[PDB]
Write a protein that binds this ligand. Sequence first.
Ligand SMILES: Nc1ncnc2c1ncn2[C@@H]1O[C@H](COP(=O)(O)OP(=O)(O)O)[C@@H](O)[C@H]1O
Ligand SMILES: Nc1ncnc2c1ncn2[C@@H]1O[C@H](COP(=O)(O)OP(=O)(O)O)[C@@H](O)[C@H]1O
Ligand SMILES: Nc1ncnc2c1ncn2[C@@H]1O[C@H](COP(=O)(O)OP(=O)(O)O)[C@@H](O)[C@H]1O
Ligand SMILES: Nc1ncnc2c1ncn2[C@@H]1O[C@H](COP(=O)(O)OP(=O)(O)O)[C@@H](O)[C@H]1O
Ligand SMILES: Nc1ncnc2c1ncn2[C@@H]1O[C@H](COP(=O)(O)OP(=O)(O)O)[C@@H](O)[C@H]1O
Ligand SMILES: [Mg+2]
Ligand SMILES: [Mg+2]
Ligand SMILES: [Mg+2]
Ligand SMILES: [Mg+2]
Ligand SMILES: [Mg+2]
Lengths: 367, 367, 367, 367, 367
Amino acid sequence: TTALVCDNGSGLVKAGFAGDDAPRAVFPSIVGRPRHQGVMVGMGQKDSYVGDEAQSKRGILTLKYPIEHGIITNWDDMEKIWHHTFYNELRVAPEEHPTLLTEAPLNPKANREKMTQIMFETFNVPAMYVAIQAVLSLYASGRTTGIVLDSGDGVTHNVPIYEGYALPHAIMRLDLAGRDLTDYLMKILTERGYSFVTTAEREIVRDIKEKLCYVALDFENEMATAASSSSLEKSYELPDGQVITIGNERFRCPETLFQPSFIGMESAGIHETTYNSIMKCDIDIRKDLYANNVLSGGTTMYPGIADRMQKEITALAPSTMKIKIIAPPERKYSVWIGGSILASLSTFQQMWISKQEYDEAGPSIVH
Amino acid sequence: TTALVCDNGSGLVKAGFAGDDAPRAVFPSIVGRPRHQGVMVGMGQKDSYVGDEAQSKRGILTLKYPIEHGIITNWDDMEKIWHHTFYNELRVAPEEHPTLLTEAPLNPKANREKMTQIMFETFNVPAMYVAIQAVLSLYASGRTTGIVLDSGDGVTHNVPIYEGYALPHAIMRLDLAGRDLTDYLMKILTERGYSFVTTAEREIVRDIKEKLCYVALDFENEMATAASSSSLEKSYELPDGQVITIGNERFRCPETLFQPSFIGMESAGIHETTYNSIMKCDIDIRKDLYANNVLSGGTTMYPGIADRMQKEITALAPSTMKIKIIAPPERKYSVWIGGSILASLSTFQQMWISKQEYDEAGPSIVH
Amino acid sequence: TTALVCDNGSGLVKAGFAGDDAPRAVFPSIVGRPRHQGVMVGMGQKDSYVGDEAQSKRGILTLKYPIEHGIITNWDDMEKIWHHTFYNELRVAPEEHPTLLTEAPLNPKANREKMTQIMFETFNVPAMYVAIQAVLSLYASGRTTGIVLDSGDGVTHNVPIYEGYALPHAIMRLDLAGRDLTDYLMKILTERGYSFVTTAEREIVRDIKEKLCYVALDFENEMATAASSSSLEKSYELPDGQVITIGNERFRCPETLFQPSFIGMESAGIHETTYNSIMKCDIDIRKDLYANNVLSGGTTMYPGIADRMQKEITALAPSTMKIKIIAPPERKYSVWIGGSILASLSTFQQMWISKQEYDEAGPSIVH
Amino acid sequence: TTALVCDNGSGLVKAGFAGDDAPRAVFPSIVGRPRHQGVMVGMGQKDSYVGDEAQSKRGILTLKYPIEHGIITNWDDMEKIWHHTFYNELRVAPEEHPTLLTEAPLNPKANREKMTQIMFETFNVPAMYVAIQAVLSLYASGRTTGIVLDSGDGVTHNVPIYEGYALPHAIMRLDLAGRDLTDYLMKILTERGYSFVTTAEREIVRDIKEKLCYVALDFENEMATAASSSSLEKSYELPDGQVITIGNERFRCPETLFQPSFIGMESAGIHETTYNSIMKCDIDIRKDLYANNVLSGGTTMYPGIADRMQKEITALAPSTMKIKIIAPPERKYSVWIGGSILASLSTFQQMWISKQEYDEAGPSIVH
Amino acid sequence: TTALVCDNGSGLVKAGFAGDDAPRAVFPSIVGRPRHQGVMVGMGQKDSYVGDEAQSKRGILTLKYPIEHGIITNWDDMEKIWHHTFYNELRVAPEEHPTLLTEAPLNPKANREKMTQIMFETFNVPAMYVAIQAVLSLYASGRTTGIVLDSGDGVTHNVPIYEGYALPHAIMRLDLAGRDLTDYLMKILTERGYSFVTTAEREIVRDIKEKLCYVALDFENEMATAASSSSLEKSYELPDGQVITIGNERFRCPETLFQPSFIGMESAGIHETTYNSIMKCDIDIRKDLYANNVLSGGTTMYPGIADRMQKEITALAPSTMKIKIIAPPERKYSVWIGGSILASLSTFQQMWISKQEYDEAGPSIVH
Ligand SMILES: Nc1ncnc2c1ncn2[C@@H]1O[C@H](COP(=O)(O)OP(=O)(O)O)[C@@H](O)[C@H]1O
Ligand SMILES: Nc1ncnc2c1ncn2[C@@H]1O[C@H](COP(=O)(O)OP(=O)(O)O)[C@@H](O)[C@H]1O
Ligand SMILES: Nc1ncnc2c1ncn2[C@@H]1O[C@H](COP(=O)(O)OP(=O)(O)O)[C@@H](O)[C@H]1O
Ligand SMILES: Nc1ncnc2c1ncn2[C@@H]1O[C@H](COP(=O)(O)OP(=O)(O)O)[C@@H](O)[C@H]1O
Ligand SMILES: Nc1ncnc2c1ncn2[C@@H]1O[C@H](COP(=O)(O)OP(=O)(O)O)[C@@H](O)[C@H]1O
Ligand SMILES: [Mg+2]
Ligand SMILES: [Mg+2]
Ligand SMILES: [Mg+2]
Ligand SMILES: [Mg+2]
Ligand SMILES: [Mg+2]
């Protein structure tokens, strides 16, 4: 009897059986709702739209994200994406295999006591377990020392590790992820005659950022030479029938992760939060984090991120020891791959929450 | 020497000398072109039309708006309304007094680099300056801290400001203003036998909206009682020789600004965009924006707006603090009045773009 | 001519003339710097704010403490709070009255060699004098023998004294005061859906701790019964209008001073550091420290601190002698009150550092 | 059949077979205990570490010395360093070779009756023997006349000898050794902006004292010239990467052994205790202790100790004779070398405590 | 006009007017000196303390005995205790009453020519006289025949006398008194985990010997039952609060007087000096020294001395006579009581040294 590893995170859904290598069920966490009525005769009059079906009719349906920066805002729409996975894509009954959920660290207590209630009352699950994304994304490389820089779509977290001894005090959250970049891209794209404000067109410009947009080496270097368009522009085709050509808006959009001054927050960037959290730790464990930094998530995919971490961090940190960053390919599933092999060990089975240990004790035992 | 304050925006044109209190030249941005020929002993000929002369001959001529939602569409018609202004109404040469232009915030770059070229190559202006309508409309009241709700004719902008230090990140534009309301009134009036398709009759129904049509307190409470037309109906004298009598189509037209669910967009109303931008600001400055909101523009003189904003915002925002809306009379000319007094200060003369500076720099120092 | 009693400590500033009973000019040690770049004419200006004016603009201005844990980190901003006080609030010329500064005990030599240089080269002061906190905080009670437990905001010090003869070897510093509590509260507050990361909201949650939060009698007794919402919760009125209600986060935040395991340091709590310093002294002077302990500072203000010192200390010490703790009201200003009466005696005027003496000896006669 | 020469002194452990010249098993007397509670699967485990493994994980493992100033404070942790050595470093069964322990002189009776019990009940040792570190470190040179100055890590002992005849009246213990110098270094290093309070950093600054710090020739000589530091400063490389440069803190830290007035103690230094004990002995044996003084231990390793003993002692003692001090290299391991050669003779084999004799007599025949 | 009887003995000072019964001026011979450097204003000052005030501040003041084993070591501290008595305790001018001093017998010419110089040059004493503590302590009982055993604090002297005639060849001094017992108690107390080295704690353990410690009947009859502590132990209450309980360390400390083998000196015990001195006298006076032995001093109030002198002396002396020891109460003040009644006679008044006689003869008439 295998286990079910599901990652209920913002952006995409990574669910599948344990012990595998790649999940066979991927779909964005969207809830489609009909806007107007029906201009033709002979269509589906249903209201609940879950899965990849809403992506084909974005101009007609209304998309909405149920999870907002990790914190579960809406609850009646969160159950829709959980029942459709176990009866359409996976096609497995939850009463036969345990479900291993995954939640972001530093999560408010208003979501942990309600997430286990859905997986017990509604969905009859024999045993469940939740943990921190930094641990599940650590087994993907086979190491137990370093710092995990998780940046998916909710909140960017920086949780280090030292031979299995976690440090909850070094958990410094940062509201700079994938959803925070598409918001700044909307206001910076309308300066060329491309007016957009409709929610249906928010995911159209997001696909352009995942390929064309990247992280440049310097900020005040490519901007002075951006007036002469020679290699920083490329024509993109839309399914509606328009031509979109960007110029200097390709490298300045991912700069928000490094420069929080674009949104208007006095917090530190992704290159400074990974260094300030190390200062709060012990001096003896401040030598195995610079050359052992691991960056995972779905947002950290711009061709040029690993080449920038060896400059801004090296300038702040004293240049004496060695600094090396590892960036393995296909890091979007670092939580699902590392979490599937975690349930294969024999020592992990002694941590599942029993059905009789919840209704007789209370939700205060999952913490 | 005095200055020239001209607000070249969609809808109407406000021009005049600086230091005054009311402009003396107002005319809509229309380009009259003869469509059908008409032989008559007396009239003839004059090909192109510009100014308030085309308003007297609408059934023969054809009007066209050169500016569309702030974005400058065509350019051969934008110069006609500028040369016919300083040599007919103002009767002053631009080579003697500086021209102070005004543009809408979050404007595309295709209009800033081209507007300064016309005011430098064609019209020999010694110095020019552009800014944001939210700042110029703030000097008309005589305050410092206060979010400006400018709703002219194209795009409604909400740019808050807390004691001089503005916040460009809280600029949330909305495509719901003046021109966006007369389009929905045409498709809703055809059900009562009053249908029009000619562009000449588009401004006839606009004058009816500026007087009879207003904003009510509630929407769903007036629809159930709309069957017994006793006080919500009034006959209108059509210049051609007809009687226009509307009933329930009086308060539902301005409701589009509050409920965008009538046209076909997933955007929010005018009372939600002014509240969502406050959430993005700091909590320390979220206590001087509800009781200090200032509304300006052309799409505001509806008798019944100040009494409605005190209820929709109160239903969403907590009722712990106090909410007070200020609406001074003659709020339509707040851009021209505030722009004339701004040039009277001695510290403002050090911000004009010199002619010798643009020839050495180029289209880059305007921003 | 009287003397100037100033306290250049972290948190708040206590300045005023000598011989008084309460300071007439208090302001936090914050520096105001603009975040964004507002576009106005005749605003401000004030590039670097100083004083209590930044409390009204905490969101716009970037708050930053120039002094960190007693050690003067930044120097160009430390002079701003020294010139703004002697020419706005006090309005006294430094060339007429001697300035009596106050520094924390066990400070680096880099601060004593630079603080006196500013009070000699820039600010022309005829005579100055520096001392440690446990001396000035002792004259406020009118006693001689008694260990002083000073806990202001940066570093908590425990400097005992037996009849004037101080003991520098028994000085045990602890980085657990006022600044270390608001940092742990920032991480424990986000567990209920209240996310805060901006520096502007660091002082907002600090005022809640100064009234609602207190030190309880036990730790595991009130927490086990905190599952039921009874009298352990109270709603606070934020300046914005939101409703914030905490549960068990009222007594667990002040517990960090007693249990340093919350942050992640192997140091001892405030109740154990005061006991280990007595062990390093002679046995004859180990009987006049438990019944004569004095606790001062700005942090020691929780209603329940004096009731706890008679239990944890009594349990460790042999239950035979008497342990009495004295805590007079208004113990925060005890450093400024004790320093004003110290400069009133005739035997204190023969200890000031002469202006001509420092220029002929150097910074080595300061100690 | 050889014997096992082990040293249970504080600081380091010197174990090995008898008849050799250098021990092959050295490790600090530290216990590794977990601090935080990590959430990992398959970590460690090892709840209690022992050996040199804790030196690589000092930031997490809480360092704690089981022996304090010779007196065994903790007993459950003292057995950990004994069983780990006989099965990992030495890899020899205690049932085949006798174990020769070494204890400090003037040891309390509560330790001799307990240390011998562990080697009989838990471990199965055929015969054991305890004595005094002064006589054991005397045979390392080849003489049996003079005074042995043993300064290991906790308590410095000065026990003379005169042809086998011991003098217990001249035994004057002093709490000034290796552990007493690193405590004063913790408070004297923070005077330059380098704050330290964590127990893990106690061994980091200890390595600097064992190499850079030394004993100068005079106290009031190198301090007056500390303003123009031309050769008393040197940059040290930390494992983290920070740069720490000390000035006058290089010679003033080891001065505590000569001037006990630094830590608030009015006792005599290492140069005065060795002179007062001689005056308490006979008169004819006064010419065999000045020119025959032997210094041993781990603390007496600073390059400059032998050059200072010829000035302070000669100034006090009459200069009518000769005072020669012997300091052979590798004097730290003199206790283990002298303990192995002593068990090689035939007169020492008849002094071991038989296992069957301890059961018939009791814990009273050990003294 | 009466006389002043002052005793300059080590340990305590017995001064008062002649003709009384108990002295009213008693204080230890200690000189309080500041150890640390307190940074306070209005403390002390008193650079040199003298009297019973130093007993309340032992943990700060440095204790030092000006007289060592009778021989005056430091003369600058000896004058301090002489001037403090005549102006605080006695409150009598030395120019009105003669001062009667008393020195120790058998002096190597060091306390005769220098002791009288202070009472003549500095102090203005009309007449003074010095003698021997043995004869002066004999008049307290009313007899003129018998050996006097004066065991105070420095050196125990045994000078017999047979009706006025004093044999100088029978004077046998022994360095075993009160100060010689508290030194052996320091090294014998640390064998139970109670370490002491501070000079302030030397008087704390001395007070325990004056009550709990006493002279037992034998020696080997109590060491066999010392392992089972049933009635030979008692918990002592320290002024700090610690619990110190000794076992066999109660009667073994006073045994050093009888058995000097615990130190290492070649001299015999106190019961051999009283027997060997009789053999050096005449043969006819051998029947008046065993039954007329008088023991006095400070080292005699041990409950268990009269029961021991009748066993060791009787076993050595021939059992063909009568042996009886007399021990009147308050034997410690026998020197001051016997010295005051001696000055009341008309014969002793003609033996004083006149002020005009010492200046004309010299320091040679003191003997
Ligand atoms: N190649 C890419 N380049 C840039 N951004 C990407 C790329 N791929 C995905 N993203 C961003 O990642 C987000 C989705 O993250 P997701 O995979 O859901 O994180 P997680 O796996 O932790 O749930 C999207 O909003 C998208 O903007
Ligand atoms: N009294 C009124 N009531 C309602 N709407 C009005 C009124 N006056 C003008 N408007 C609207 O304002 C629009 C013109 O705005 P305009 O004055 O050009 O704005 P701005 O002054 O900012 O350029 C017109 O489309 C018209 O519908
Ligand atoms: N009533 C209170 N309860 C708890 N903490 C307080 C209270 N008043 C002040 N503090 C803490 O004291 C700190 C300020 O200390 P301060 O008065 O500057 O010390 P000092 O007077 O020694 O400079 C603040 O950070 C605040 O958190
Ligand atoms: N090279 C050195 N210079 C100065 N001090 C040293 C040196 N090596 C060791 N020490 C001191 O010796 C102490 C350890 O003594 P240790 O070798 O354990 O004594 P023992 O061998 O008698 O157990 C440490 O506290 C350290 O301060
Ligand atoms: N009750 C007592 N029992 C035992 N020893 C005592 C007692 N009282 C005093 N002593 C000892 O006597 C010493 C003081 O002697 P002191 O009275 O000064 O002699 P003197 O009177 O000859 O100067 C102290 O060191 C103390 O140890
Ligand atoms: Mg993730
Ligand atoms: Mg406008
Ligand atoms: Mg203070
Ligand atoms: Mg040793
Ligand atoms: Mg005496």
